[PDB]
């Protein structure tokens, strides 16, 4: 981190920054918990219009979040915040990020991170919402996304999601209106866990959305 | 030692011009404490007071500087500065105009006194009978007086006094400079419009224009010049027709919106009666305008587009009458007289003017004949669905 | 025939389960409608609930049109009294809540609602709209289908409001004829005043609405009154909305805030003077709240090294 601030401060060529970036990306599982966020902060400052895809790919490959165990919670949170700020105060991060998990097609070894980031992006800038739905339907039908995924997702990272529960429902709504039982089952589990872990207002909104489904659907 | 200098003195007011222009471009200026509005406001007050005493105490007629310094007169530069100050302070410090003037009771009387001063300054400019005619000074005067008329209520008595004085000036003074005439007519419209409908004034303008220009047939000897003095063969022919056309255009837009709201409705009767009174007067204005032998620039095609608009308003009118004539049944006699005068005076002379623009030698005349034939078509439909023949009036 | 005051609930509860036709259900609802003028106000909510579940048969339009006219005259009469406010608010809210469940279950109800309301039949202002009307629309926009439709409608209607208003003030002749009509802007402002009590469902759309106005018609040309006054008044209205909102609502702050910051920071090209003056007014009126809404500004400073200078000064 000091090194990085200083390198931001000094008069340099960027080709060296790239080397260092790759260097840290290798040295990216091999960091302690606390600083991690600010490192990533650096990276995402450092990124550009074009390199973005590849660095993200590497990143998406190197971040795990089952590895990070008051043993990981505060920092994870802060991390997500940071990312949240990043993709708030610029756009193309999100389209690239989506592209990256979208073209991760051959991978039946999908990790937790992806869904979490999807929720987040759904919650934030909305032009792409139909893009997100589309892609999520497509990986579900492909069977690359499944349910023990969602199980461990809500068994740990829920705290991140509490403050965007409304996103989950606005999605599940568009999930159950489709065909292809597995999709419909996914939306179910959504409603289920949402009512399960979250608070009263959530529960209430659950019931109120299901009833709508019943009566109208 | 400094009062002997003249270059120095004009330089200092040019600096003040740069201060005010900085402020008018920005929200503030460059100089020290040029970010807090209050100090700026106070400085403006004092500056204005100084320039007022200059131009009041000392008249314009003190330039023994040179025939090049007549347009660089300190008496002129202080006026232009005053103008910009009033513009900018209206823009920004609208919520302090009273206290602003108090350094010089409602805003009405303050404005009235300042207006006496300024319009009398212009009055002695005019009664100078100066053949050089400092149109720069005259234009700054009408400009700033226009800037100032906006603070009087359109119901305040001094507003009415100002309208009186303006009409009076337009009735006596001619002053052959088309731009002075233009800004003065714009101001008189800004008054007359805000006090009532202008159609009386519009009709008087069309009458003077018909008088001065003559006619398309060049055997209709007309001179209705008595209506207003500010009408000139150099000014009235190219310019003032276009302004009064834009005015009639705005009135046509208003009555179009009225037709729209009354259509959407089905409060009703006195609304349509006021509308048709306006439209009869606009038709009289159109008749006064069309017989004129205008120049073949944009004046003729603007008149043709305005007559297209007239026929379009008439089409919408007969359309709303086709909408209503099932519920109530019948036609108002006022509308009967209206379509009568339309078929009688307008359409034959309309085609005469089309013939007069076409014989002498692209888009509007097709649009106008389309408008008048659509008007005739909807008149067929209304004569059918109104239980009254409306082509017996027509030829 | 005449009904009992107490027994209209059960009267309509009977027509609930009958096989009825158009005019059957029409006369049922018309009688129950005219019965509203002889009622305590704690009685109206379940009455309208049952009126609507019966409206489900065919009889949709007239239920809402009557409720609209009723509450319109009611709020006018209450404003003339001002010339039980809290109770009156508490009613209107639960009415709108139950109308929400209704259009939630019926994806057509809202369409006729819209079609009943849309001022742009050609563009002339209808006298149909009202504070309560608008409040219903904004509590509705949080449904996923109608949202953008409604928020476009309101926008264009406000636009027409201001166009006709600037023509009025521009012309004496028309000012002589028409009586002033409660404009859409002022309608919204009074709605905000009423929103204070328990109107949580409305604020979520109010936020979006204001920001939408600002983003839609913000200064972009310099990077004229016909073009600029509407746009300026529009963003100005969005500003007033967000201002008077942020003054009183303690759960949409941070998000009003971060939205302003988000639209401000990144774009860095298009004018944001409107946002900034807004922000200035906000902060000035009530800073202490922002000691609670802290971290967004600490992180906003992180871009300060990248931002352009003049904007940073402001």
From TrEMBL, chain C:
The highest taxon in the source lineage is Eukaryota
Q: Which residues form the FANCI solenoid domain?
A: 202-314
| Domain FANCI helical: start-end pairs | 108-194
- For this entry, the protein name equals Fanconi anemia, complementation group I
Which stretch of the full sequence is covered here?
Answer: 167 to 498 of 1328
């Amino acid at each position: 981190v000091p090194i990085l601030d200083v390198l931001s401060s000094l008069r340099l060529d960027p080709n060296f920054l790239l080397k260092v970036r790759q260097l840290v990306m290798d040295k990216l599982s091999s960091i302690r918990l606390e600083d991690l966020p600010v490192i990533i902060k650096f990276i995402l400052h450092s990124v550009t219009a074009m390199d973005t895809l590849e660095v993200i790919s590497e990143l998406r490959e190197k971040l795990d979040l089952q590895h990070c165990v008051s043993s990981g919670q505060s920092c994870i949170i802060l991390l997500f915040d940071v990312i949240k700020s990043a993709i708030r105060y610029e756009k193309t991060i999100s389209e690239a990020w989506i592209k990256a998990i979208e073209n991760t097609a051959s991978v039946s070894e999908h990790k937790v991170f992806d869904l979490v980031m999807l929720f987040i992006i759904y919650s934030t800038n909305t032009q792409t919402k139909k893009y997100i739905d589309r892609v999520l339907r497509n990986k579900i039908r492909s069977g690359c996304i499944q349910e023990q995924l969602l199980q461990s997702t809500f068994s740990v990272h829920y705290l991140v999601l509490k403050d965007m529960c409304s996103s989950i429902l606005s999605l599940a709504q568009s999930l159950l209106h489709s065909l292809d039982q597995s999709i419909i089952s996914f939306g179910s589990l959504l409603y289920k866990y949402a009512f399960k872990f979250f608070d009263t207002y959530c529960q209430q909104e659950v019931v109120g959305a299901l009833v709508t489904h019943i009566c109208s659907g | 030692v400094l009062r002997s200098s003249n270059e120095f003195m004009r330089y200092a007011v040019n600096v003040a011009l740069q201060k005010v222009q900085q402020l008018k471009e920005t929200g503030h200026v460059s100089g020290p404490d040029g970010q807090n509005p209050e100090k700026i406001f106070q400085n403006l007050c004092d500056l204005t007071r100084v320039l007022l005493w200059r131009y009041t105490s000392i008249p314009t007629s003190v330039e023994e500087s040179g025939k090049k310094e007549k347009g660089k007169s300190i008496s002129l530069l202080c006026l232009e500065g005053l103008q910009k100050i009033f513009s900018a302070v209206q823009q920004f410090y609208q919520p302090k105009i009273q206290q602003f003037l108090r350094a010089l009771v409602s805003v009405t009387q303050r404005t009235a006194f300042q207006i006496r001063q300024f319009q009398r300054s212009l009055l002695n400019l005019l009664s100078s009978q100066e053949e050089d005619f400092n149109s720069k000074e005259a234009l700054l005067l009408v400009t700033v007086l226009t800037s100032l008329s906006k603070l009087l209520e359109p119901s305040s008595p001094q507003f009415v006094q100002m309208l009186s004085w303006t009409s009076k000036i337009c009735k006596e003074n001619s002053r052959e400079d088309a731009l002075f005439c233009k800004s003065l007519m714009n101001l008189l419209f800004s008054l007359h419009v805000s006090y009532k409908s202008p159609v009386i004034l519009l009709r008087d303008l069309s009458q003077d224009i018909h008088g001065h220009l003559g006619d398309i047939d060049q055997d209709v000897e007309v001179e209705k010049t008595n209506h207003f003095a500010i009408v000139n063969l150099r000014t009235a022919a190219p310019t003032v027709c276009l302004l009064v056309l834009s005015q009639a255009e705005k009135v046509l837009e208003e009555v179009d919106w009225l037709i729209t709201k009354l259509k959407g409705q089905v409060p009703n009767q006195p609304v349509e009666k006021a509308i048709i009174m306006q439209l009869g007067t606009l038709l009289t204005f159109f008749h006064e305008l069309v017989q004129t032998a205008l120049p073949s620039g944009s004046c003729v095609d603007t008149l043709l587009k305005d007559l297209c608009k007239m026929y379009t308003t008439l089409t919408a009118l007969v359309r709303y009458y086709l909408q209503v004539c099932q519920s109530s049944g019948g036609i108002p006699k006022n509308m009967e007289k209206l379509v009568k005068l339309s078929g009688s005076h307008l359409t034959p002379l309309c085609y005469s003017f089309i013939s007069y623009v076409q014989n002498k030698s692209t888009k509007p005349i097709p649009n106008l004949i389309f408008a008048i034939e659509q008007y005739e078509k909807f008149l067929i439909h209304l004569s059918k669905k109104s239980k009254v023949s409306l082509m017996q009036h027509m030829k | 025939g005449r009904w009992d005051q107490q027994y209209v609930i059960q009267l309509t509860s009977m027509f609930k389960d009958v096989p009825l036709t158009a005019e059957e259900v029409e006369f049922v609802v018309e009688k129950a409608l005219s019965m509203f003028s002889k009622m305590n106000l704690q009685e109206i909510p379940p009455l309208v609930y049952q009126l609507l579940v019966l409206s489900s048969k065919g009889s949709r339009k007239s239920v809402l049109e009557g409720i609209i006219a009723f509450f319109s005259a009611l709020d006018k009469q209450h404003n003339e009294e001002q010339s039980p406010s809290g109770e009156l608010r508490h009613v209107e809210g639960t009415i709108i809540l139950h109308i929400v469940f209704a259009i939630k279950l019926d994806y057509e109800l809202g369409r006729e609602l819209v079609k009943h309301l849309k001022v742009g039949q050609q563009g002339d202002s209808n006298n149909n709209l009202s504070p309560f009307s608008i409040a219903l629309l904004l509590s509705v926009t949080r449904i996923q289908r109608f949202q953008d439709q409604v928020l476009d409608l309101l926008k264009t209607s406000v636009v027409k409001s201001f166009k006709d208003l600037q023509l009025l003030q521009g012309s004496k002749f028309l000012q002589n004829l028409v009586p002033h009509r409660s404009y859409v802007s002022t309608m919204i402002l009074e709605v905000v005043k009423n929103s204070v009590h328990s109107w949580d469902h409305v604020t979520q759309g109010l936020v979006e609405l204001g920001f939408i106005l600002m983003d839609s018609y913000g200064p972009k040309k310099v990077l004229p009154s016909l073009s600029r006054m509407p746009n300026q008044h529009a963003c100005k209205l969005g500003a007033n909305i967000l201002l008077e909102t942020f003054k009183i609502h303690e759960m949409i702050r941070q998000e009003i805030l971060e939205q302003v910051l988000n639209r401000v920071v990144t774009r860095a090209s298009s004018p944001i003077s409107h946002f900034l003056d807004l922000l200035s007014n906000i902060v000035m009126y009530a800073p202490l709240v922002l000691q609670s809404c802290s971290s967004k500004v600490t992180e906003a400073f992180d871009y300060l090294s990248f931002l352009p200078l003049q904007t940073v000064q402001r």
